[PDB]
Ligand SMILES: CC(C)CCC[C@@H](C)[C@H]1CC[C@H]2[C@@H]3CC=C4C[C@@H](O)CC[C@]4(C)[C@H]3CC[C@]12C
Ligand SMILES: CC(C)CCC[C@@H](C)[C@H]1CC[C@H]2[C@@H]3CC=C4C[C@@H](O)CC[C@]4(C)[C@H]3CC[C@]12C
């Protein structure tokens with residue numbers, strides 16, 4: 120899982136394809152779902168071949184380092200904030216966004232530049248509604264997302280000089296295989 | 297007052313003349329006479345110099361080793377090595393206050409600190425100067441850690457004297473030796489357990505103005521002593537507390553999500569789902585009572601000085617505020633009022649945000665949390681001041697232009713705020729004259745706040761991360777040390793025996809002849825160099 | 828064995844006495860303190876007196892132990908784990924700036 124995770128991904132795509140065949144010959148419509156998962160995973164598996172080119176290989180190593188160092192911590196804090204504020208907002212709403220799934224998706228849109236800020240009006244206490252949404256926006260959009268860009272820049276600075284040696288290790292494993 | 301109590305012996309020593317002081321000391325001039333002048337005291341609001349309010353300390357603080365030796369082992373008049381001034385500072389206490397951690401001062405003070413102790417051993421074998429306290433009740437070891445004097449604190453903790461008959465004064469012994477390996481013991485006395493002022497307690501419970509509070513925990517005996525407490529018993533209790541808090545917050549979320557929507561609480565009991573919902577509400581109230589009492593208990597036990605409550609230990613205030621919201625919710629609920637929903641949703645949001653307290657206990661998450669706190673304190677406040685100025689000014693101008701609906705200050709402020717999150721309309725209204733004025737105002741606001749100020753905040757964040765990254769591992773370790781001390785006092789609280797660090801071991805002989813037993817902590821080191 | 832103590836003190840004359848006396852040089856001290864034992868404090872040297880001089884920079888003793896006439900140490904002796912003197916020299920190194928030389 121820390122090394123040679125590409126073998127796992129190719130094997131998992133093969134498993135999806137076999138499940139697709141099994142569902143197809145059983146008169147079931149879910150074979151489409153298994154097959155689209157297989158298609159997406161197979162197109163993503165093309166990134167294995169960035170080794171064999173120096174610049175692309177170093178770029179791929181940097182991507183892997185960033186994923187392992189920053190994204191996990193960011194996701195923990197982000198999910199805490201999103202879930203807490205979504206539960207509060209949905210408890211305020213009265214009789215449609217009176218669902219936890221619907222309200223979670225509305226708050227997620229603020230992250231991609233699509234937040235409504237007036238998506239519903241089925242509540243009492245309008246002052247409570249806007250104070251909750253403004254506090255969520257300041258904490259996650261203005262603060263946390265801009266902080267992730269600053270933390271990525273520090274990672275690039277420290278690992279840039281050494282990344283040419285990790286790429287050569289990965290290509291050496293390809294040569295022996 | 298300015299120079300009251302000054303004696304002739306003060307002048308001679310200050311001029312650093314060996315023959316001049318020899319004359320006056322021989323003449324029988326009092327050496328125990330104290331010059332209690334404010335010029336010689338601390339007097340932070342005025343210029344001056346502090347030396348210990350005694351001629352004997354004056355030579356020690358001025359690197360007059362020959363005079364110090366003359367003043368004590370002579371025959372005409374022997375100075376009192378244990379004399380205390382009005383404030384109670386001994387010569388050893390005055391030596392700590394002279395040091396200022398600079399590169400040259402430390403080598404002077406510690407070298408002089410050693411010889412005055414050894415001289416006291418040859419002269420007063422039964423007298424222990426290190427345990428004498430001033431009027432405040434601070435030993436020299438306790439005052440050195442309290443005032444941030446890291447250079448002298450390191451010397452005291454691991455003082456190892458090779459000379460026989462002075463080995464009993466040492467604090468860092470040696471068990472045996474090997475090829476590259478040597479085993480050393482540590483005194484560990486009055487460090488973790490003490491009557492009034494433990495070394496660990498003094499460092500942790502500071503008012504944040506101590507210059508090197510993060511760095512004083514990196515000395516050799518202290519760093520491994522705290523790591524031993526964590527790996528032995530504290531870590532398991534911390535994980536238990538995290539699990540119970542997670543369960544409390546899930547039950548609270550479920551009970552609020554299924555609240556009835558009829559009118560005029562309280563609500564009647566029917567079906568079977570109401571009995572499950574009422575059970576969840578009882579647990580939510582009991583949780584808020586527990587956090588209410590733990591909040592006043594903390595204040596009474598520590599008595600924060602209203603500055604170490606907002607800069608340090610702001611999590612206690614947040615847990616207490618959540619408990620207050622829950623109690624207000626109950627009060628409103630039993631008064632047939634609908635605002636209990638508002639108080640309860642504020643309580644729910646604050647309780648879910650309070651989960652970030654437990655990022656301490658994991659190294660990477662803890663460093664991340666410390667960095668988040670630093671950026672909030674350094675960048676966001678200034679950004680908010682400038683941003684609010686721009687937003688309010690341009691919103692008042694735009695709303696004054698609008699004629700007969702966005703003709704409200706609240707409505708126009710919200711329209712301009714949407715530009716910050718990528719949702720600005722730029723054509724949201726048309727009820728005006730002078731369309732050219734409307735566009736010029738909106739375009740100037742967009743360029744100043746979106747293209748310039750917001751992108752500048754990202755650049756300023758990157759500079760903060762670059763400067764604070766190296767030290768952040770040490771702020772996290774200070775935060776976890778406070779957790780370790782709090783758990784020890786609260787959980788066990790009856791025996792304080794299962795958590796004892798080290799063990800009783802034999803290290804030497806009392807100069808009188810008795811056996812001295814000290815709770816020692818074993819530390820292992822390897823040296824391939826200096827065979 | 829007694830030969831372990833003399834060499835550990837880095838005394839060229841002291842080890843010369845015991846090596847001359849006919850004390851076994853091939854006797855191995857299979858103690859856990861002398862093994863790796865990552866979970867406990869200790870030191871590893873190769874489970875043989877001949878390796879002990881090598882790992883302690885005792886060149887003169889090593890030359891004495893091999894090209895003498897009374898008792899020549901086994902340069903190919905293997906301990907319980909199988910580590911030769913050359914094997915033990917690798918595990919002593921820790922890549923630090925002074926150890927490598
Ligand atoms: C949704 C489906 C159909 C397609 C998605 C493709 C995804 C899963 C592929 C693209 C890149 C991949 C990641 C790339 C790198 C890492 C870091 C590694 O140390 C663990 C595996 C992990 C975390 C991979 C997991 C799966 C991954 C996210
Ligand atoms: C709107 C309600 C219901 C939920 C919001 C939770 C908020 C208030 C919590 C989340 C993070 C918290 C902040 C985290 C850090 C700091 C810096 C500190 O030195 C002062 C307190 C302060 C400024 C906290 C104040 C309150 C805070 C913003």
Ligand SMILES: CC(C)c1nc2cc(O)ccc2c(=O)n1-c1ccc(C#N)cc1
Nearest residue numbers: 125163164166167170176179183286289
């Ligand atoms: C993260 C990178 C972009 C990556 N992503 C993949 C995704 C998959 O789904 C399957 C395989 C891979 C994969 O191999 N790499 C990768 C890793 C190292 C090197 C080097 N040097 C080249 C490529």
Ligand SMILES: CC(C)c1nc2cc(O)ccc2c(=O)n1-c1ccc(C#N)cc1
Nearest residue numbers: 611649650652653656662665669772775
């Ligand atoms: C800012 C961070 C994320 C934070 N935010 C909180 C929010 C609250 O509402 C309550 C408590 C906290 C809280 O304790 N921290 C915090 C501080 C230091 C360390 C360390 N080391 C760990 C966590």
